[PDB]
UniProtKB/Swiss-Prot annotation:
One of its GO terms (molecular function) is beta-N-acetylglucosaminidase activity. It comes from Gallus gallus (Chicken). The keyword RNA-binding does not apply. In the egg white and polymorphonuclear leukocytes. The keyword Nucleotide-binding does not apply. Lysozymes have primarily a bacteriolytic function; those in tissues and body fluids are associated with the monocyte-macrophage system and enhance the activity of immunoagents. Has bacteriolytic activity against M.luteus. The gene is LYZ. GO terms for cellular component: cytoplasm; endoplasmic reticulum; extracellular space. Substrate binds at residue 101. Its EC number is 3.2.1.17. Keywords: Allergen, Antimicrobial, Bacteriolytic enzyme, Disulfide bond, Glycosidase, Hydrolase, Secreted, Signal. This is Lysozyme C. Belongs to the glycosyl hydrolase 22 family.
Length: 129
């Protein structure tokens, strides 16, 4: 499912993401924009063999199991395919574990390079929240 900008912001807001660990809702919307282009079914292979999954491109190296990342972790205790569903519940819950790992939203390379320090609030303006 390819989310609308305000549709994704409302879904992230309903699942408790806005101001989670001090990151306002605009940061999460901006991150999903540049990680997956609002597409829950996005996947991208990495050089080390792991794969990013879903609306926030959560990596199978640490957070989910896809059966093909040898010596990896499954800290969110889910199959990576669950991160591709039209329901973003699993992606949001796993993201809350990632952002609480000590490095904040810097775990998402797209957010650090394309959202951090910008006017992230602009990604939720015009939305009826
Ligand atoms: C939080 C998370 O899983 N981030 C991943 C990370 O593995 C990496 O920096 C990159 C790989 O292309 O994509 C995503 O940002
Ligand atoms: Cl914001
Ligand atoms: Cl694996
Ligand atoms: Cl949803
Ligand atoms: Cl932080
Ligand atoms: Na894994």
């Amino acid at each position: 499912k390819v989310f609308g900008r305000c549709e994704l912001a409302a879904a992230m807001k309903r699942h408790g993401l806005d101001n989670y660990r001090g990151y306002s809702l605009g940061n999460w919307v901006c991150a999903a924009k540049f990680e997956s282009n609002f597409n829950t079914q996005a996947t991208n292979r990495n050089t080390d063999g792991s794969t990013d999954y879903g609306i926030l491109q959560i990596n199978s190296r640490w957070w989910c199991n896809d059966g093909r990342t040898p010596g990896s972790r499954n800290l969110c205790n889910i199959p990576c395919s669950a991160l591709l569903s039209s329901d973003i519940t699993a992606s949001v819950n796993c993201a809350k574990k990632i952002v609480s790992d000590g490095n904040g939203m810097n775990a998402w390379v797209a957010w650090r390079n394309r959202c951090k320090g910008t006017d992230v609030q602009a990604w939720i303006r015009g939305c009826r929240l």
